[PDB]
Amino acid sequence: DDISKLIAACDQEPIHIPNAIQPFGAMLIVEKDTQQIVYASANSAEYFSVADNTIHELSDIKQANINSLLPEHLISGLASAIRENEPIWVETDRLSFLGWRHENYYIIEVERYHVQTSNWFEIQFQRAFQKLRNCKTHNDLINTLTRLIQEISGYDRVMIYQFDPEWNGRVIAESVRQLFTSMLNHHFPASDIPAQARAMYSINPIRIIPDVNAEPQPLHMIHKPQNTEAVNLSSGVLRAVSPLHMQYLRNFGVSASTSIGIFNEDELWGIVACHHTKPRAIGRRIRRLLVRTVEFAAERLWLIHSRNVERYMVTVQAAREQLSTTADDKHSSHEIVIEHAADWCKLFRCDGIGYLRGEELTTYGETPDQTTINKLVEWLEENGKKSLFWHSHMLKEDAPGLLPDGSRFAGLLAIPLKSLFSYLLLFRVAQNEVRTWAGKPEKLSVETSTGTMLGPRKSFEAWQDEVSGKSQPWRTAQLYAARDIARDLLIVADSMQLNLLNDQLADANENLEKLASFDDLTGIFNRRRMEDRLESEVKEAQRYKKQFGILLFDLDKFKSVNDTYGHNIGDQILQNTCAAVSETLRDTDKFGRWGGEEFLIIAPQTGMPELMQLGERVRAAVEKMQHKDLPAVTISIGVAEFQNDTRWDHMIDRADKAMYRAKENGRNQVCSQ
């Protein structure tokens, strides 16, 4: 942690106010209201001697006038400018001026310039934009960017350096001409670019160090300013470089550098870092070119990214359509999970899936055991996180004591499904990412004008470390896809159980209907359904002039059967006779049990002679029916016909008298009266 303190001290050095400049130009600082020159870079006289003859040494600038040192166009522009830190570029024959207003000051930088004329720059823009426009993948864009930046700048090494969410970074593309060792995929620490340093790219996108060993030129006071606090030099390019970073570059083996921040809207997403093994200046026009190219390649990379999102979203919809088309074929949600979880593992970039529904747990791929999965589920409920999803890429740290000791899982995405509980679980094995860093960790202290700080490390040689217990983090697009899949499963599960419950409710109500309208011993209609049916048959026949008749029969000398044989045997006979009678009947007829041992048949659409015929078929059916162990059995049948009757008892009385006459005339008979 002493190194944590050392790194934190890096932020102490006020790099925006070094009171010195790099020597590839000069600088004046003027008061706006006073109109006086208050500061001048120590090499000012070798530049402004072009504007004014008398200026041979620095001390001279005290008696010079600004309106003698600057082109009138730059004075007019500065007098006119209201916005601050918006630099104005005005050039002459031999000097190129860059000036801006900052609070009450006019800061003016001057470089040596000579007019070259060509169409080179416009051709480079056309070629760069054509190539960037043709990039359709992440890797293509960044590599074309590295090629263009290298061809334009001539720097011996160019590399795209992407930041992590913790500010550590990695070289993701690289173009090297000379004998540099390749730094592709090497990781660099946050302390390499302090927050103040990263914040500069937001004020000026390009930083230029044309010579790491160029002695910086301090600013000298010339007329006493009203404020005296060091003037902010951040908007320009001449601002002196921290000696810590110069020694860093020396240790890195770099003589000149140029870096351009890569912005995603207002966020610093990375930098284009360019190195040279010898000093190397870049003119204003090449600076503007590199910056415009990187700004263009940037928005192209954001457009490629946002498009890959839309296209993922399409892929998710295609997967959900795949789910519903297979869903309509009577499968359970567990069956659907088994078929598509391999696709889902690709869709969600996870190593395993587990689905919970009731007592059943379905797993595909790498998963914890059932018991640990329930410890997970329980902890999700007991933690009380009502979040639509719960997710972590370092389970061991975000939820300690949750997993077994040696378990390899680090990522969990859990979607709750309402009730009892249900869940969708997405698992990611920890990826034991071996990281290659550019240099050992070096805890070295360095004494500085601000205090004691971390010094730049001396070795940049490859050093590997390993990260365990972590997975890839769960991207937002995957959270929403997983949520959508989970609910598409809930709809399959809901439809399944709705159908099953409808089956159970129909079966239960059907048993309620069976016990209400049938006879326990025989299974034929009980008397209440016969009585009701007969009453409506009478009403119908009287209203609409239909024809029907009834058969009322009884078992003969049946009590002798019960007493000689038994009640178990007697009931087997009643069941037998009902089975034999039902085979004779037509589907229109209704057959039920009227009393003990007495049965009723309602024969609709039947005239009297055909009725007698049916009574004969019934009487003969019970006669010949196979007795097997039990005794032979006989029925005596009475018959009645609809003769404009008022009430159904009148029919039952007629049929009963006929049936009783059948009993007196020899029991095995059909009788009507």
Binding site for Cl ion (CB under 5 A): 237, 284, 287
Q: Which of positions 199-228 make contact with ligand LBV (CB under 6 A)?
A: 200, 207, 209
Shortest gap between Cβ of 538 and its own copies (angstroms)? Answer: 14
> Which strand ranges, in their side-by-side order, compose the sheet holding 670-672?
590-595, 598-604, 548-555, 635-641, 670-672
Q: How far is the CB of 286 from ligand LBV (least distance, A)?
A: 15
DSSP structure string for 385-396 = ---S-EEES-HH
Residue 149's contacts (CB-CB under 8 Å, 6 or more residues apart) are 155, 158, 175, 260, 272, 274, 290, 293, 294
In the list 162, 656, 661, 663, the residue contacting its own copies (rule: CB under 8 A) is 656
540 binds its own copies (CB under 8 A): no
Nearest-approach distance from CB 438 to ligand LBV, in angstroms: 7
Which are the contacts of 259, defined by CB distance < 8 A and separation ≥ 6? 201, 206, 207, 271, 272, 273, 274
267-276 and 422-429 as β-strands: parallel, antiparallel, unpaired?
unpaired
Which lies closer to ligand LBV via its Cβ, residue 213 or residue 564? 213
Which of residues 346, 385, 546, 559 is near its own copies by CB under 8 A? 559
**CA-angle at 530, arms to 524 and 533, nearest 5°:** 125
Cβ neighbours, 10 Å, residue 204: 19
Strand order in the sheet with 88-91: 20-21, 217-221, 37-41, 26-31, 105-112, 95-102, 88-91
Give whichever of 115 and 434 is closer to Cl ion, judged by the CB atom: 115
**Window 446-505: residues binding ligand LBV (CB under 6 A):** 453-456
The Cα 153–Cα 230 span in angstroms is 33
* Least distance in angstroms from the C-beta of 207 to ligand LBV: 4
CB count, 10 Å around CB of 268?
18
538 near 546, Cβ under 8 Å?
no
Which two tokens mark 170?
């990695």
Least Å from the CB of residue 190 to its own copies? 27
Nearest to 191 by CA among 3, 374, 348: 3
303 half-sphere exposure, CB direction, 13 A CA radius: 12
237 or 373, CB closer to Cl ion? Answer: 237
Report the site for its own copies in 487-516 (rule: CB under 8 A): 487-488, 490-491, 494-495, 497-498, 501-502, 504-505, 508-509, 511-512, 515-516
Residue in 284, 375, 529, 533 binding its own copies, rule: CB under 8 A: 284
Binding partner selected for residue 161 from Cl ion, its own copies, ligand LBV, none, CB under the kind-specific 5 to 8 Å limit: ligand LBV
Q: Which helix (H) or strand (E) holds 625?
A: none
Q: Does 175 bind ligand LBV (CB under 6 A)?
A: no
CB nearer its own copies, residue 62 or residue 650? 650
Phi, psi of 58 (to 5 degrees): -65, -40
Nearer to its own copies, 167 or 421 (CB): 421
Cβ 289 to its own copies, closest distance in Å?
8
Contact 350, 413 (CB under 8 A): yes
Q: Which two tokens stand for residue 376?
A: 């997970």
Picked from Cl ion, ligand LBV, its own copies, none, the partner binding residue 273 (CB below 5 to 8 A depending on kind) is: ligand LBV
Identify which range of 45-53, 118-126, 164-172, 335-343 contacts its own copies by CB under 8 A: 118-126
Q: Does 373 bind ligand LBV (CB under 6 A)?
A: no
The token pair that represents 227 in the structure block? 């404020």
In the bound state with its own copies, the residue whose beta carbon lies nearer, of 387 and 459, is 387
Residue 257 binds which entry of ligand LBV, its own copies, Cl ion, none, with Cβ cut-offs from 5 to 8 Å by kind?
ligand LBV
Helix (H) / strand (E) containing 436 = strand 434-438
Shortest Cβ 167–its own copies spacing (Å): 24
List all residues 6 or more positions away from 235 whose beta carbon is below 8 Å from its beta carbon: 85, 87, 100, 102, 107, 203, 204
Site string for its own copies, 328-347 (x = CB under 8 A): x-------------------
User: Using the rule CB under 8 A, which residue among 531, 540, 616, 645 binds its own copies?
Assistant: 531
Minimum CB distance to its own copies, residue 490 (Å): 6
- Of 288 and 435, nearer to its own copies (C-beta) is 288
* 133 belongs to the binding site for its own copies (CB under 8 A): yes
58 within 8 A of 44, measured Cβ to Cβ = yes
463 binds its own copies (CB under 8 A): no
Q: Which does 194 bind (CB under 5 to 8 A by kind): ligand LBV, its own copies, Cl ion, none?
A: ligand LBV
Residues that bind its own copies (rule: CB under 8 A) add up to a total of 74
Q: Is 193 in the site for ligand LBV (CB under 6 A)?
A: yes
Sign of the C-alpha dihedral computed for residues 121, 127, 133 and 138 taken in this order: negative
* Burial bucket for residue 518 (CB in 10 Å: 0-12, 13-18, 19+): middle
237 binds, among Cl ion, its own copies, ligand LBV, none (CB under 5 to 8 A by kind): Cl ion
The minimum distance between CB 452 and its own copies, in angstroms, equals: 41
The one of its own copies, ligand LBV, Cl ion, none whose footprint includes residue 117, by CB under 5 to 8 A per kind, is its own copies
369 is in an annotated binding site: no
Three-class SS of residue 23?
coil
Q: Rounded to whole angstroms, how far apart are CA atoms 328 and 469?
A: 41
Give me the 46-85 binding string for its own copies, x by CB under 8 A, dash otherwise: ----------------------------------------
Could you tell me which stretch among 243-251, 324-332, 584-592, 625-633 binds ligand LBV (CB under 6 A)?
Answer: 243-251
- Contact call for residue 287 and ligand LBV (CB under 6 A): no
HEC letters along 298-332: HHHHHHHHHHHHHHHHHHHHHHHHHHHHHHCCCCC
Q: Does residue 190 bind ligand LBV (CB under 6 A)?
A: no
For residue 14, report the phi and psi dihedrals to the nearest 5 degrees: -80, 80
In angstroms, the CA 413 to CA 393 distance is 9
Residues of this chain that bind ligand LBV (CB under 6 A): 10, 13, 15, 159, 161, 169, 171, 188, 191-194, 197, 200, 207, 209, 241-242, 244-245, 248, 257, 259, 271, 273, 453-456
Binding residues: 527, 554-555, 557-559, 562, 571, 593-594, 597, 656, 663, 667
Binding residues for Mg(2+): 554-555, 597
Binding residues for GTP: 527, 557-559, 562, 571, 593-594, 656, 663, 667
